[PDB]
């Protein structure tokens, strides 16, 4: 089980999630969760503020060790802490990775539907994307065709949001062998890895010696422990040459993490596992509930079963809703989900629903939607 | 007057300042202050943590208005809030400014002695610096020669750290006219502007219509209110074309500010002025004390009177100390100051001393130095 603040206290968090839409609209959109903050993480932040830890980051951080120990305990990956480094956030890590660890101007394979900031990542790095369809899984043949068309890296979310997918180890093994044959890198975004509820996360970088060479692994405790605004993520290298190359970069390229964020992240990794296990159990139950009920109450809605994350991709193309389903549900049901068109052109007609909230909130949301949809124009 | 935490509580802040050197070494180096945090700022952070404001930043921020109102009240500059934007920190703003608002590969005039991160800024942007001597002030003839040698921007700290200088308005006016004649930008770093204790800060961007076009102004409350680790600074544009160009940049280029940092910065600007005035009065007194006593107790040390900042540039070249004076004082006096060689090659023999601490700490520090220096090898 999990604790939740009152709905009043949730709004009073005064984050993007609660300020984008009106007071009557239930927000099930941006990836922040509604769980009361993990007690160990909240206390670490509270104590740091009381201590006035507001200057520059201290020497002697054990965050890299904490990260390595978490990777070892949870996934059986023996990460080297000397190859783990702080960064402000996961997308900034991917930005540095493309800009400094792939050849200049080289195309980047981006599976779709894609985490919407990935399109901004392409514009920021000035790289052309090669888009491949990840719906129902990724075909390695599509990946090879991208490399044959000139791509020198692939961005791989694992777990794969917004589809809730957990890639198999032998699949990651062949992906890395393929990348190596084309002198390409695999940039693995593992921000959702703590949130697997049906299956097991495999760290791609550890499936082979080839994988260790081709992967650059990027993660944060920000999704699982809900501290995105504190700015602390981790870059996990799996070979000495990448770590050396990182160390040679100007500090200005690598800096940004917040002092409080370093403290919150370390506490999450060291003391947040019990909470994580309860969180994941609660998400699995919400998932099973939504998977059954949504199609029964909102006719034509289709959902594919998931294995990880709190983000549910719903197909509304078999409804007869006019225009964007997201906009319909905001205006007529007072329930906010992300419009799938932001994830790629083939996301049109889909919505992404955030189920990291209470069963009560989910019931209310689907009931509002069930009524509104019964007489949409 | 000002409050200070106990020396035990200062160490327990566990920031870079307190963790670089051993327990017996008084740290007067990195630019963090030892004042108890401004009560209004501390309470804003405390309340935000209690509210669990840990997700993404909210819509409807009034930080730009707060910044504009501070600029108006303190300096008489009527900044437009719609031209003010958040960034993670001041150096990141300068990085974006060089990379996106000056021509590709164009040289950058960097006065010396220089804030040490400026050398990392040059390596990160891949630009060659044209170094001019700022000791005793900046000669506009040296600036013109730089532009004639191809530079298309100048980095201008105003107030100028580490020399404590406050530039005159008619000087800023001619600098901007000069820059305009060479199609160059003036990138004004005003992070120390709240900390003028003898004179008045002029906002360069407001001295003329030409200045409004050529300047890009970058600041933060991080120095004056000691919140560098919270990651929130401001970019202040002074013409619509720059603001438009900023808005057209990929969000990935511009993001990074922390949620708590946005909250702390707004509180600093809205409610921190009384504290600021007491801080500045305390710094002026520390400055007057050090200016008189250092030369009397540490023979050969020379100091030029300052008008702003809490960073004192001390010349030890007329001592007969062997090797780096910074290293001598760390090893033999247990007092840590920055080695001037990090500020440029002509900084060798200088140290930078941070006097944003108690008179008690300063007395103890100069006394340790006075004894050690009496029999240096
Ligand atoms: Cl999101
Ligand atoms: Cl806990
Ligand atoms: Cl997503
Ligand atoms: Cl930064
Ligand atoms: Cl510093
Ligand atoms: Cl106050
Ligand atoms: Cl300085
Ligand atoms: Cl940042
Ligand atoms: Cl960022
Ligand atoms: Na992150
Ligand atoms: Na700053």
């Amino acid at each position: 089980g999990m604790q939740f603040p009152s709905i009043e206290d949730l709004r009073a968090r005064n984050t993007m999630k609660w300020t984008r839409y009106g007071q009557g609209v239930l927000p099930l959109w941006v990836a922040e969760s509604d769980f009361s903050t993990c007690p160990a993480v909240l206390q670490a932040i509270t104590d740091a503020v009381q201590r006035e830890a507001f200057g520059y980051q201290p020497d002697g951080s054990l965050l890299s060790q904490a990260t390595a120990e978490f990777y070892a305990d949870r996934y059986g990956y023996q990460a080297r802490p000397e190859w783990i480094f702080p960064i402000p956030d996961v997308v900034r890590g991917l930005y540095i990775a493309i800009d400094h660890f792939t050849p200049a101007q080289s195309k980047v394979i981006v599976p779709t539907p894609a985490y919407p900031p990935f399109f901004h990542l392409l514009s920021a790095t000035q790289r052309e994307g090669i888009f491949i369809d990840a719906t129902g899984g990724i075909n390695l043949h599509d990946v090879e065709k991208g490399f044959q068309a000139g791509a020198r890296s692939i961005l791989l979310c694992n777990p794969y949001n917004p589809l809730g997918m957990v890639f198999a180890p032998e699949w990651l093994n062949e992906l890395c062998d393929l990348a190596h044959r084309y002198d390409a890198r695999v940039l693995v975004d593992e921000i959702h890895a703590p949130l697997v509820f049906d299956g097991q996360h495999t760290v791609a970088a550890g499936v082979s010696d080839t994988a260790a060479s081709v992967c650059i692994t990027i993660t944060a405790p920000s999704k699982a422990w809900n501290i995105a605004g504190l700015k602390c993520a981790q870059i996990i290298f799996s070979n000495p040459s990448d770590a050396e190359h990182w160390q040679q970069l100007s500090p200005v390229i690598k800096d940004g993490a917040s002092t409080l964020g370093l403290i919150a992240a370390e506490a999450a990794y060291r003391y947040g596992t019990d909470f994580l296990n309860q969180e994941v159990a609660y998400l699995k139950n919400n998932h099973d509930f939504l998977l059954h009920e949504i199609p029964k109450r909102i006719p034509g809605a289709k959902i594919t079963p998931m294995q990880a994350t709190y983000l549910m991709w719903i197909d509304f193309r078999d409804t007869t809703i006019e225009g964007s389903p997201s906009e319909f549900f905001i205006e007529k049901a007072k329930v906010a989900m992300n419009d799938g068109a932001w994830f790629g052109e083939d996301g049109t007609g889909f919505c992404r629903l955030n189920f990291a909230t209470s069963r009560e909130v989910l019931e209310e949301a689907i009931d509002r939607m069930a009524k509104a949809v019964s007489h949409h124009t």
Side-chain angles (χ1 to χ4, degrees), chain A residues 1-22 24-199 201-277 279-330 333 335-377:
Chain A
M2 293 291 285
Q3 296 293 112
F4 297 89
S6 66
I7 198 72
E8 292 82 22
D9 286 345
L10 278 169
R11 306 190 193 113
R13 292 175 163 190
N14 201 46
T15 61
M16 183 180 287
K17 184 176 186 172
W18 299 98
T19 56
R20 181 61 50 86
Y21 300 98
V25 175
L26 281 170
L28 283 59
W29 67 292
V30 60
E32 298 174 28
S33 64
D34 297 352
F35 305 118
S36 304
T37 306
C38 170
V41 170
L42 178 60
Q43 191 49 51
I45 297 164
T46 300
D47 169 76
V49 170
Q50 289 168 349
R51 289 189 293 106
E52 303 186 24
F54 305 146
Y56 297 105
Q57 71 198 252
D59 289 3
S61 177
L62 303 176
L63 174 58
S64 290
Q65 293 177 214
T67 306
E69 286 163 9
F70 179 82
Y71 261 69
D73 296 341
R74 191 89 179 165
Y75 317 130
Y77 178 70
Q78 308 300 311
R80 307 201 189 189
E82 63 272 22
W83 291 348
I84 305 185
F85 302 89
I87 37 166
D89 56 68
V90 171
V91 173
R92 171 74 61 68
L94 291 167
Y95 181 27
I96 300 161
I98 290 158
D99 207 26
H100 293 281
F101 295 74
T102 72
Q105 292 151 244
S106 58
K107 297 177 192 169
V108 179
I109 300 170
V110 176
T112 57
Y115 181 52
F118 282 6
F119 298 97
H120 298 136
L121 190 54
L122 288 176
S123 59
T125 59
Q126 306 173 52
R127 303 302 188 76
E128 182 184 339
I130 292 181
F131 303 110
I132 63 174
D133 187 29
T135 306
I138 296 180
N139 187 343
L140 284 161
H141 188 51
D142 292 342
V143 182
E144 182 156 22
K145 282 198 294 185
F147 294 145
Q148 287 173 323
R152 298 288 295 274
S153 57
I154 174 165
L155 275 180
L156 188 78
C157 290
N158 185 34
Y160 194 93
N161 56 301
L163 302 177
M165 309 183 303
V166 169
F167 293 111
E170 69 272 22
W171 190 86
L172 298 167
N173 180 67
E174 178 64 21
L175 172 68
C176 293
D177 278 5
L178 177 60
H180 184 255
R181 293 193 287 276
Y182 289 90
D183 203 7
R185 304 306 306 259
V186 181
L187 309 180
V188 194
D189 182 342
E190 301 198 351
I191 203 173
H192 300 274
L195 301 167
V196 176
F197 58 79
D198 187 9
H201 176 66
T202 297
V203 182
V207 303
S208 68
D209 288 348
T210 298
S213 290
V214 317
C215 295
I216 294 173
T217 305
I218 313 185
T219 195
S222 68
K223 288 288 152 79
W225 291 277
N226 205 48
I227 49 174
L230 281 65
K231 314 310 297 189
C232 183
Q234 297 76 49
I235 188 160
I236 304 171
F237 294 110
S238 47
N239 64 77
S241 66
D242 287 337
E244 171 174 52
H245 188 240
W246 178 265
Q247 285 181 298
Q248 292 161 350
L249 295 173
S250 171
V252 172
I253 293 164
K254 298 175 290 198
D255 293 357
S258 93
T259 294
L260 291 179
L262 293 158
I263 288 161
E266 187 169 4
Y269 282 136
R270 288 193 187 282
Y271 302 111
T273 292
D274 288 342
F275 173 96
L276 179 68
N277 290 337
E279 182 176 9
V280 152
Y282 197 96
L283 298 173
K284 179 173 188 308
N285 284 340
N286 278 357
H287 162 276
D288 294 352
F289 168 73
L290 289 171
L291 190 65
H292 198 74
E293 300 306 304
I294 286 184
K296 300 199 302 182
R297 297 183 200 194
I298 304 163
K302 290 172 176 186
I303 302 153
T304 296
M306 299 166 57
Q307 300 171 274
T309 82
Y310 58 66
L311 302 167
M312 181 169 284
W313 194 235
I314 308 169
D315 187 358
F316 292 100
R317 292 176 301 170
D318 299 306
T319 72
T320 63
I321 294 166
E322 202 165 301
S324 164
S326 169
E327 287 174 22
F328 171 75
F329 290 113
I330 289 164
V335 173
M337 299 168 294
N338 301 72
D339 190 318
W342 292 110
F343 297 73
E345 64 196 352
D346 292 338
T348 303
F350 291 79
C351 294
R352 191 194 65 188
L353 177 152
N354 178 344
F355 64 87
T357 189
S358 67
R359 180 62 54 83
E360 273 202 321
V361 167
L362 292 176
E363 182 65 30
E364 172 66 20
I366 70 173
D367 290 345
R368 286 177 184 193
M369 296 183 297
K371 291 169 82 83
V373 90
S374 70
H375 67 292
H376 68 70
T377 198

